[PDB]
Write a protein that binds this ligand. Structure first.
Ligand code: BCL
Ligand code: BCL
Ligand code: BCL
Ligand code: BCL
Ligand SMILES: CC[C@H]1c2cc3[nH]c4c(c3C)C(=O)[C@H](C(=O)OC)c4c3nc(cc4[nH]c(cc(n2)[C@@H]1C)c(C(C)=O)c4C)[C@@H](C)[C@@H]3CCC(=O)OC/C=C(\C)CCC[C@H](C)CCC[C@H](C)CCCC(C)C
Ligand SMILES: CC[C@H]1c2cc3[nH]c4c(c3C)C(=O)[C@H](C(=O)OC)c4c3nc(cc4[nH]c(cc(n2)[C@@H]1C)c(C(C)=O)c4C)[C@@H](C)[C@@H]3CCC(=O)OC/C=C(\C)CCC[C@H](C)CCC[C@H](C)CCCC(C)C
Ligand SMILES: CC(C)=CCC/C(C)=C/CC/C(C)=C/CC/C(C)=C/CC/C(C)=C/CC/C(C)=C/CC/C(C)=C/CC/C(C)=C/CC1=C(C)C(=O)c2ccccc2C1=O
Ligand SMILES: COC(C)(C)C/C=C/C(C)=C/C=C/C(C)=C/C=C/C(C)=C/C=C/C=C(C)/C=C/C=C(C)/C=C/C=C(C)/C=C/CC(C)(C)OC
Ligand SMILES: COC(C)(C)C/C=C/C(C)=C/C=C/C(C)=C/C=C/C(C)=C/C=C\C=C(C)\C=C\C=C(C)\C=C\C=C(C)\C=C\CC(C)(C)OC
Ligand code: HEM
Ligand code: HEM
Ligand SMILES: [Ca+2]
Ligand SMILES: [Fe+3]
Lengths: 319, 60, 258, 280, 317, 60, 57, 56
């Protein structure tokens, strides 16, 4: 019956803290920070202000462009009739260029807007990684986001520049819509064996799990010992305490081994990065490498073998 | 106004500002919804009939 | 893959790659995992696992140098530590047996209410002033417009019966979040910091029940050296107490139910 | 053995349903009333399964029967024996294992609790673990029941259990459009993003630039207050986390409890109630 | 745009297509499997045949399809070929007031062909149609025009001369999903290759555009929907191509996807001339034949009931 | 309003603001929801039938 | 029930009382449901109630 | 055994074994109805008098 740190019960407030000032080059921060009791009944109720440098704008701009394309072309589809646009929303989208112009600039119509819009969600995305490392260390901060961001941004390119363009196919590159995009993953699994057989996916999974696992534990753990300032990890990292005392101990008399209020945060950043890493891996192999991972698998002695209560015939042979 | 007579006490329990800005939207939305819904199937005066066939007669 | 060697191609090479560097990085972590708390203490048992190495397979890493903030000493890791006391007696001499909290456990400072001796220097804010302070100096603050102000709420023992009340709710200059509530006890007529984390709000009856320690225990609550600010050392100190209550405040709690 | 500072927490008792007996440690693990049992199932599984590895498909002789994790897998009984003990060889054994594994996660789960008590801490951990526990039941129990078949669950194959999904998944064609699977997926993603941020940030403040001080929240709470504009807060992250994950699970849990016993058409269709709205 | 929990109460259907615990399974809502049967019911055949009499090519001015039939039997046919077809309009539907040898009615012209359709089928593709064969009741189920035809879908509106993509939309055509929304015309009508699995593990073989298998899907969707059974039914998922792994059903579908090729590219197609507009499509066409047209979301139209067996004039001689 | 005599007491346990504005949303949804259900199925008075198609006869 | 009044100093008033109230509702919803599945499906299954199979058809 | 069993309650609390077993009986209580209603006689939907479900 103890206040289980769910939603900050009683809150409090103080003026808008525009963060630690920045050196000679970091333009002025911008915004008149706001407060939201609700949002704040979970976290730092203050809102903003936010920075906006060159890449900051430069990137944001290159952002709300593809959107203004992948967004436009899409609406066009349902002949500028929003009503249905609203209906066939989750279905709509913008497809890539036809297998002909494999790499050539597709016409203003046939998959053109997609290559256009694409490149603008190729830069802005890559430019925003800059809007990190930049605003990152200019805080006296090292780089670990910027890092991961790549690992992720890596996989994104393994779904474009690096592979789709690597197989000469302005098609082999994912569409641009929830469902259709939801289909690309579907389509892919097929066109090439069946991904469940490409290790680097069955791998990249365990990770997307671990993260779904760990940052899910340490999120609790912290909480469990959040009374003992566990949440204050920062210092716990430096000057330990009963927090990291009670915590790690848990896992010690649980799964045996254990670690530190520091270490964990490591595996964290790792499993995560070691996810999109393995992602873009398979996705890169699958295409210009093995064509059917199911065959691959068994051909390596991997793929299992069950009895056979059902089998069919083969027209191409008897006929 | 069988009840609208003593109904005045209504301002007292209901926030003037909360109720005023609320109908402001419900009406603003209900109406855009109704013209959206009716115009969809019933009578789509837009792409439905007359006066002339700007598209049909003009395009061709 | 389990038999030995069968197929042979390219991609299957790489699967070996990552699934190698993994077993490398795995160790990296292992080491980085060991920084603090290492090496181990007693021989109550040996290292469970495949290869029972001296002390952990990954040779303990080297010292790490933590450059603390302005006006702050420097910390490192690993960093040999001075053995502590064990205010308790082993229920059994058997390796792995528990240690009973000699005398009054509530303060015997053990397990359920034990703690380390963090630096006796109030952790400060960005520039200088100390982060966690009472709403006294925290005058530039204001209760969340809406949330019922806790200043004046009468605390109530887990036994139910009252146990003093409140005073200043120690906010913070770093994050507008309440972290402590001053509790002018009833018998001591003193001030005992209340760890919000342990304080359950009951905005319905102005109360703030804490199912952690009986009303009386608010007297044995480690007293604050200074009321205008609290140091890391004690930051852990006040907390750890109530903590014990979780397994002390009643003979019931500690002992099994079935 | 004990940690540098563990030696001072190993109080006596704190157990749940009894356990003041085996209330001790071994290596770095606390036993109690649950570390004990879970073990049982463990070998009467980790090894009971070995029997399976031994037996295999046809028999322990069939060229089909192998010893390669990649292939080894214990198959559930045929839908035939609905909600009844199947012949180990034909199904039961599978059930048996599963029988155990249930408790092995129910024990270790509880054992976690006794611990959570000893170390006089919070219990967010187990409570969390439970979801994960549950999602394993509502995916080999809650479902198969509303399908009248135990053998109607899934296998225990290193990768073999993969297909089991492949099928039951296609049983609705584009499983992808399942409303849940969408969200539940989304979470298992968002989680793997925030995580790839917190665990990052921290490891970027406590070990910041060269010749720099162990930064303070006075940075963190601005790090994103700059890039993205706003910062959920520090305490928060360790909330959003459990949230995401402890939801993602419970979601997916729904995701496959309803797929079948609550919906037979191809999911893509479910998405029709949308279209057919008397509006567009 | 919101999260949901199944809108069907349990327990459902339970067909174990595959080995104990492997995957391929099948689930159906009884409460539907019910109606769908109690509704997809066959109309009892006509009373016994005459067996007596000469023929019909004899007595009748012009009777090419049913020439060998005895008058009586032959008449059964007309009756049937009425109730199965337009028992609302009577005989006159395929005939002229009086003069019955007239071929001045496009309905008849084709009706004629429809006969060369059924039989030809019932006898030569028994590998798909088997012993249940087909009747007029099938596609026409008490209706002159089969509610289950399919003119090449134009697609959704065109944006100022600009909407080439034919994937993103969502159209029942495909159990509902952003897909070609018309895999039929380029498949069921024409005959575009359907395989896409790479024959060999490594590359250097199948150069098929993913987009290509991207279409097979849709098709496959429809198919799977038409009969109303998950891809498990004919497939072993992991093995969408390994026949040795598929199920009997598959092959039994193979042909079908050609008997239709036939039926469309050979019968319903040509007869477009005699067919008015009201049966023609926008891109100018004849409502051909989908697997749905007969199947109507079932595995053996009217679940295996074999009407055609009770009609001798419905088999190539 | 016979209940009233004995029904007044309800309001001491049920906050006026909590139940007043609350039911206001309930009435608003169910309603919108019903037309949605009836309209969509029973009889779609709008696009369903009479007096007769106007856009169809005027279009062609 | 003559000497079963004493059970009350042990079992708390609040916990059991509404603890069972719920026990009922879940068993109540559970039972109607378990039976309806197969046994007797009084709902959509026969007459006079047969206005769907006969009417709709 | 019960002859000297009276002593039981000296070491255990009243609510301890008092409701735990009740919970154990309800769990086993219905855990069994199901397993039996499964093979021996699925009385619920097994044979007759189906008159009302069938003839009905
Ligand atoms: C057929 C192929 C379909 C498909 C079919 C299915 C099916 C079928 C299912 C899912 C399920 C899920 N899918 Mg899917 N899915 C597809 C594509 C995807 C994609 C994708 C990017 O393409 C994603 C991200 C997902 C994501 C998801 C998750 C939301 C969800 C739950 C997983 C889980 O963690 O259970 C969490 C599970 C557990 C916690 C239990 C295991 C842990 C136990 C308690 C402890 C083990 C201890 C051990 C035995 C002891 C030894 C010690 C060892 C060291 C471990 N799917 C394709 C389209 N998907 C599943 C689901 O919804 O489950 C609810 C499910 O059943
Ligand atoms: C279905 C076949 C019929 C039909 C049959 C019916 C039937 C039958 C009924 C309606 C009803 C309604 N129909 Mg109709 N309706 C049809 C076609 C239409 C069409 C159309 C375009 O074709 C439209 C736009 C409508 C629209 C409407 C609404 C005006 C109306 C009420 C909704 C409601 O639940 O209140 C929501 C409620 C509230 C917000 C609050 C509760 C009300 C209280 C008493 C007052 C508030 C007190 C408050 C505390 C004081 C402060 C005051 C202000 C709020 C500040 N109908 C067709 C032709 N319709 C219902 C109706 O009009 O009842 C009068 C009804 O019973
Ligand atoms: C299955 C074949 C039969 C059938 C056979 C049975 C049988 C046999 C039984 C029921 C019973 C019930 N059936 Mg039936 N039922 C059928 C078809 C239906 C249909 C339908 C639409 O077709 C419906 C809507 C129902 C609905 C119902 C419920 C009214 C009822 C109680 C369930 C419960 O769990 O209470 C849970 C209980 C509670 C929450 C409260 C506990 C009660 C105490 C004593 C009073 C409360 C005191 C309190 C402090 C004072 C305030 C009162 C309120 C709590 C506020 N049946 C078919 C025709 N039905 C049961 C029943 O009603 O018995 C009387 C029962 O035994
Ligand atoms: C399977 C073949 C038969 C059949 C054979 C049997 C047999 C044989 C038995 C039952 C029994 C039961 N059957 Mg039957 N039953 C059939 C079909 C049914 C159907 C059905 C829909 O078809 C139903 C709904 C039931 C339902 C029931 C239950 C009423 C009953 C007890 C269950 C239980 O374990 O509670 C669990 C237990 C408890 C809650 C605790 C014990 C009670 C104590 C004495 C009081 C508590 C005291 C405590 C200190 C204070 C109260 C606190 C509370 C614990 C909170 N049967 C078929 C026809 N059934 C059992 C029975 O009714 O015995 C009387 C039994 O022995
Ligand atoms: C394992 C690695 C995981 C990961 C890591 C990861 N993601 C990251 C990072 C990292 C390390 C970042 O550093 C970066 C980030 O958040 O930096 C602050 C990011 C990020 N991950 C993101 C998304 C994302 N990550 C995903 C996944 C993952 N990222 C992996 C799980 C996913 C998926 C598919 O699950 C998504 C969707 C972004 C939030 C962010 C990168 C943002 C970026 O590059 O933005 C560029 C700029 C724009 C898009 C312009 C926006 C335009 C306007 C500001 C908005 C206006 C409204 C809008 C157009 C709506 C339409 C309205 C119209 C009517 C106008
Ligand atoms: C959203 C919740 C996430 C989660 C959370 C989570 N997991 C947890 C916890 C938490 C909070 C713990 O506290 C606990 C832990 O590590 O405690 C120290 C744990 C744990 N999560 C684990 C695994 C695990 N979690 C997974 C996922 C998740 N766990 C989710 C992503 C997954 C997968 C597949 O995604 C796995 C494999 C364990 C390492 C550990 C629990 C260990 C435990 O209780 O083990 C008991 C039993 C044994 C050691 C012996 C096994 C003997 C059995 C008889 C055999 C069982 C056979 C099995 C069913 C077949 C497996 C074969 C498959 C390949 C088909
Ligand atoms: C032929 C042949 C060899 C046959 C085999 C025959 C055999 C061996 C038979 C025996 C079979 C048996 C009995 C096996 C069981 C043996 C046992 C007991 C194994 C241990 C079981 C077990 C659960 C091991 C752990 C499993 C693992 C590694 C899971 C990985 C998940 C993962 C990444 C966990 C992270 C672990 C860490 C680092 C935890 C520490 C940790 C965490 C998580 C915090 O959150 C935290 C917060 C604040 C401060 C500190 C900490 C902290 O230290
Ligand atoms: C010295 O002076 C000082 C400075 C002190 C003060 C100065 C004051 C000044 C300078 C004031 C200036 C005021 C000005 C400039 C005011 C300008 C006002 C304007 C331009 C008003 C315009 C109003 C328009 C309105 C209210 C439009 C309303 C539209 C409505 C309600 C639309 C509803 C639409 C629906 C429901 C649509 C549905 C759409 C479909 C049918 C498509 O949905 C299907
Ligand atoms: C009309 O619109 C209005 C005005 C109403 C505004 C509304 C807009 C809206 C609602 C927009 C909505 C957009 C949505 C929902 C988009 C969804 C997108 C999704 C789900 C995308 C999913 C996946 C996308 C991927 C994987 C994209 C990959 C893109 C790549 C890899 C692009 C690569 C580009 C390269 C490499 C370019 C290289 C340059 C050249 C081509 C020259 O090199 C040869
Ligand atoms: C029950 C009312 C009907 C009667 C009494 C009837 C009668 C006849 C007769 C007497 C002939 C042979 C006439 C000749 O060419 O010499 C004939 C032929 C034919 N009837 Fe009908 N008929 C009826 C309904 C229909 C219907 C509804 C169809 C439409 C599908 C139809 C299609 C045909 C065809 C296609 C032939 C030519 C036979 C062949 O080529 O084998 N009849 N009918
Ligand atoms: C909706 C789920 C389905 C999907 C995703 C699907 C997918 C596929 C794919 C990708 C192929 C080509 C494999 C290759 O050769 O490379 C294929 C072939 C085939 N499928 Fe399906 N299928 C589905 C349902 C069905 C159903 C229900 C049947 C059975 C009636 C069926 C019968 C066949 C047959 C006979 C072939 C090979 C002949 C051909 O069409 O060229 N499929 N399917
Ligand atoms: Ca597409
Ligand atoms: Fe953390």
């Amino acid at each position: 019956p103890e206040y289980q740190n769910i939603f900050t019960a009683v809150q409090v407030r103080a003026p808008a803290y525009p963060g630690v000032p920045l050196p000679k080059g970091n333009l002025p921060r911008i915004g008149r920070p706001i407060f939201s009791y609700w949002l704040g009944k979970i976290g730092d109720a203050q809102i903003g202000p936010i920075y906006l440098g060159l890449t900051g704008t430069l990137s944001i701009f290159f952002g709300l462009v593809a959107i203004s394309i992948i967004g436009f072309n899409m609406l066009a589809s349902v002949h500028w009739d929003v009503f249905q646009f609203l209906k066939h929303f989750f279905w709509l989208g913008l497809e890539p260029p036809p297998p002909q112009y494999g790499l050539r600039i597709p016409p203003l119509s046939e998959g053109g807007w997609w290559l256009m819009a694409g490149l603008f969600l190729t830069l802005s995305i890559l430019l925003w990684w800059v809007r990190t490392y930049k605003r990152a260390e200019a805080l006296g901060m090292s780089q670990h986001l910027s890092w991961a961001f790549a690992a992720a941004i890596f996989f994104y390119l393994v779904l474009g520049f690096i592979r789709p363009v690597m197989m000469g196919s302005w098609a082999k590159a994912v569409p641009f819509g929830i469902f259709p995009h939801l289909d690309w993953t579907a389509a892919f699994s097929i066109r090439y064996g069946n991904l469940y057989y490409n290790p680097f996916h069955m791998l990249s999974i365990a990770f997307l799990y671990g993260s779904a696992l760990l940052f899910a534990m340490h999120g609790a753990t912290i909480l469990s010992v959040s009374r003992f300032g566990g949440d204050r990890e920062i210092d716990q990292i430096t000057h330990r305490g009963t927090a990291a005392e009670r915590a790690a101990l848990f896992w010690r008399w649980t799964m045996g081994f254990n670690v530190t209020m520091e270490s964990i945060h490591r595996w964290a950043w790792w499993c995560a990065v070691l996810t999109v890493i393995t992602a873009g891996i398979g996705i890169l192999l699958s295409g210009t490498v093995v064509d059917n991972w199911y065959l691959w698998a068994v051909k390596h002695g991997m793929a299992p073998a069950y009895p056979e209560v059902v089998t069919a015939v083969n027209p191409y042979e008897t006929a | 106004f069988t009840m609208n007579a003593n109904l005045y006490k209504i301002w007292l329990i209901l926030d003037p500002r909360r109720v005023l800005v609320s109908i402001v939207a419900f009406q603003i939305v209900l109406g855009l919804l109704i013209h959206m819904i009716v115009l969809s199937t019933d009578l789509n005066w837009l792409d439905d009939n007359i006066p002339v066939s700007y598209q049909a007669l003009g395009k061709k | 893959s389990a038999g030995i060697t069968h197929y042979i191609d390219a991609a299957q090479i790489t699967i070996w790659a990552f699934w190698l560097f993994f077993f490398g990085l795995i160790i990296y972590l292992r080491r980085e995992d060991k920084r603090e708390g290492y090496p181990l203490d007693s021989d109550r048992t040996e290292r469970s696992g495949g290869r029972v190495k001296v002390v952990g397979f990954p040779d303990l890493p080297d010292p790490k140098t933590f450059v603390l903030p302005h006006n702050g000493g420097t910390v490192v890791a690993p960093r040999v530590e001075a053995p502590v006391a064990v205010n308790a007696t082993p229920f059994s001499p058997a390796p792995g047996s528990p240690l009973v909290p000699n005398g009054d456990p509530m303060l015997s400072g053990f397990g359920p209410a034990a703690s380390p001796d963090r630096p006796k220097h109030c952790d400060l804010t960005f520039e200088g002033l100390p982060k966690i302070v009472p709403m006294r100096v925290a005058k530039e603050f204001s209760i969340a417009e809406g949330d019922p102000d806790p200043r004046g709420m009468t605390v109530v023992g887990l036994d139910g019966e009252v146990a003093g009340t409140v005073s200043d709710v120690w906010v913070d200059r770093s994050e507008p979040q309440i972290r402590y509530l001053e509790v002018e006890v009833a018998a001591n007529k003193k001030k005992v910091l209340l760890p919000i984390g342990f304080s359950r709000f009951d905005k319905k009856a102005r109360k703030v029940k804490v199912d952690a320690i009986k009303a009386a225990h608010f007297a044995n609550v480690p007293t604050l050296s200074n009321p205008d600010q609290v140091t890391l050392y004690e930051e852990d100190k006040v907390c750890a107490y109530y903590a014990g209550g979780k397994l002390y405040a009643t003979a019931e709690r500690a002992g099994p139910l079935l | 053995a004990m940690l540098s500072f563990e030696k001072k927490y190993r109080v006596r008792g704190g157990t749940l349903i009894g356990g003041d007996l085996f209330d001790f440690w071994v290596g770095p693990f606390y036993v109690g009333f649950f570390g004990v049992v879970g073990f049982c199932f463990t070998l009467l599984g980790v090894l009971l399964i070995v029997w399976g590895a031994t037996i295999g498909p046809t028999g322990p002789t069939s060229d089909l029967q192998t010893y390669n994790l990649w292939r080894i897998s214990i198959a559930p009984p045929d839908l035939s024996y609905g909600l009844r003990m199947a012949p180990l060889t034909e199904g039961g054994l599978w059930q048996i294992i599963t029988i155990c594994a249930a408790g092995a996660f129910i024990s270790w789960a509880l054992r976690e609790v006794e611990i959570c008590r000893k170390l006089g801490i919070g219990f967010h951990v187990p409570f969390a673990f439970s979801f994960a526990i549950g999602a394993y039941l509502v995916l080999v129990f809650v479902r198969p029941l509303l399908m009248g078949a135990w053998g109607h669950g899934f296998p225990y194959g290193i990768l073999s259990h993969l297909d089991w999904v492949s099928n039951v998944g296609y049983q609705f064609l584009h499983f992808h459009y399942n409303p849940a699977h969408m969200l539940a997926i989304s979470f298992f993603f968002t989680n793997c993003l925030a995580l790839s941020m917190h665990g990052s940030l921290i490891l970027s403040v406590t070990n910041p630039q060269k010749g720099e001080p162990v930064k303070t929240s006075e940075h963190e709470n601005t790090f994103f207050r700059d890039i993205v504009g706003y910062s959920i807060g520090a305490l928060a992250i360790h909330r959003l986390g459990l949230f995401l994950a402890l939801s993602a699970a419970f979601w997916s849990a729904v995701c496959i409890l309803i797929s079948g016993p609550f919906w037979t058409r191809g999911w893509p269709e479910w998405w029709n109630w949308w279209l057919e709205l008397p509006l567009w | 745009s919101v999260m949901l929990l199944g809108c069907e109460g349990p327990p459902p259907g339970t067909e174990q297509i595959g080995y104990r615990g492997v995957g391929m399974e099948n689930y159906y809502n009884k409460r539907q499997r019910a109606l769908s049967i109690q509704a997809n019911q066959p109309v009892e055949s006509l009373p016994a045949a005459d067996s007596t009499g000469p023929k019909a090519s004899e007595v009748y001015q012009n009777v090419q399809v049913l020439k060998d039939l005895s008058v009586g039997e032959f008449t059964r046919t007309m009756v049937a070929v009425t109730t199965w077809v337009s028992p609302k309009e009577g005989c006159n539907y395929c005939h002229v007031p009086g003069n019955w040898a007239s071929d001045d009615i496009y309905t008849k012209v084709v009706s004629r062909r429809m006969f060369e359709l059924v039989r030809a089928a019932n006898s030569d593709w028994k590998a798909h149609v088997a012993e249940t064969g087909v009747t007029c009741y099938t596609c026409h189920r008490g209706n002159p025009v089969p509610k289950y035809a399919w003119v090449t879908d134009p697609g959704p509106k065109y944006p100022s001369g600009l909407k080439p993509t034919g994937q993103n939309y969502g159209s029942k055509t495909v159990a509902y999903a952003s897909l070609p929304f018309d895999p039929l015309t380029p498949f069921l009508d024409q005959a575009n290759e359907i395989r896409i699995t790479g024959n060999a593990a490594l590359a250097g073989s199948n150069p098929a555009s993913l987009k290509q298998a991207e279409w097979t899907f849709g098709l496959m969707m429809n198919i799977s929907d038409s009969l109303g059974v998950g891809c498990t039914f004919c497939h072993n998922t992991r093995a969408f191509n390994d026949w040795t792994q598929s199920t009997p059903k598959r092959t039994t579908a193979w042909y079908a996807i050609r008997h239709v090729r036939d039926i469309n590219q050979n019968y319903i197609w040509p007869l477009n001339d005699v067919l008015p507009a009201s049966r023609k499509g926008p891109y100018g066409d004849p409502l051909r034949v989908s697997c749905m047209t007969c199947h109507q979301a079932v595995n053996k139209p009217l679940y295996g009931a074999q009407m055609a067996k009770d009609y001798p004039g419905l088999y190539k001689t």
